[PDB]
Design a protein around this ligand. Structure first.
Ligand SMILES: CCC(=O)Nc1onc(-c2cc(Cl)c(O)cc2O)c1-c1ccc(OC)cc1
Length: 207
């Protein structure tokens, strides 16, 4: 297991997301589904000229898996996946510059829900999760697990879990007071509100 420090800017972003009073937490799901959609677009586009890139799985979809026993909401996609380097490099984001812009925007009247316009929507996971685990597999690399409970550091390790084939799994270990996001009615409502036109099937698993 390798432990890394977040860059100062990202640690600051995470602290802001965790400590700022902001009731409209449900946008985290929109942001994560948007990331999955982007990753699905990328593998789709690459497959247009090289169909072998789908040898690791032809289906392009998003699954939402609540588990009330474990208090986890998991978002699974079969998009392009991230390399180890991507994970370490802020989950494939322009986190330093994006955070800078987001901060200035918040002073220019913006609110936290606009975080995706600054390329760092992933971190909205911390609106509802005390810990986030990201398991990912890119065609050109091995399967890795990234994890962080904030507090300035994250870990990366080779994943020993179920082989994914290709794509990304985000496991949200929910805060005790955020269990509404495990309720079928609530998830359906949020997907319909914010993700109605996403171009991949979104399947909400039941328990
Ligand atoms: C497609 C992008 C890319 O090159 N590679 C990716 O491969 N997998 C993911 C991914 C990342 C997260 Cl955090 C997720 O929740 C779900 C995902 O499938 C991304 C990705 C998506 C949006 C980004 O910035 C907006 C940066 C990276």
């Amino acid at each position: 297991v390798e432990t890394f420090a977040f860059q100062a800017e990202i640690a600051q972003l995470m602290s802001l997301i965790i400590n700022t009073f902001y009731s409209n937490k449900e946008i985290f799901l929109r942001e994560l589904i948007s990331n999955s959609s982007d990753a699905l677009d990328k593998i789709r586009y690459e497959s247009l000229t090289d169909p072998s890139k789908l040898d690791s799985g032809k289906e392009l979809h998003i699954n939402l898996i609540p588990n009330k026993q474990d208090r986890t909401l998991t978002i699974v996609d079969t998009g392009i996946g991230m390399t180890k380097a991507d994970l370490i490099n802020n989950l494939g984001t322009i986190a330093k510059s994006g955070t800078k812009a987001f901060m200035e925007a918040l002073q220019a009247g913006a609110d936290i829900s606009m975080i995706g316009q600054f390329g760092v929507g992933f971190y909205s996971a911390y609106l509802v999760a005390e810990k986030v685990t990201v398991i990912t597999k890119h065609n050109d690399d091995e399967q890795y697990a990234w994890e962080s409970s904030a507090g300035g550091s994250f870990t990366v390790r080779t994943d020993t879990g179920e082989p994914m084939g290709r794509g990304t799994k985000v496991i949200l270990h929910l805060k005790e007071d955020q269990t509404e996001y495990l309720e079928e009615r609530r998830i359906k409502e949020i997907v319909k509100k914010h993700s109605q036109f996403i171009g991949y099937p979104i399947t909400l698993f039941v328990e």
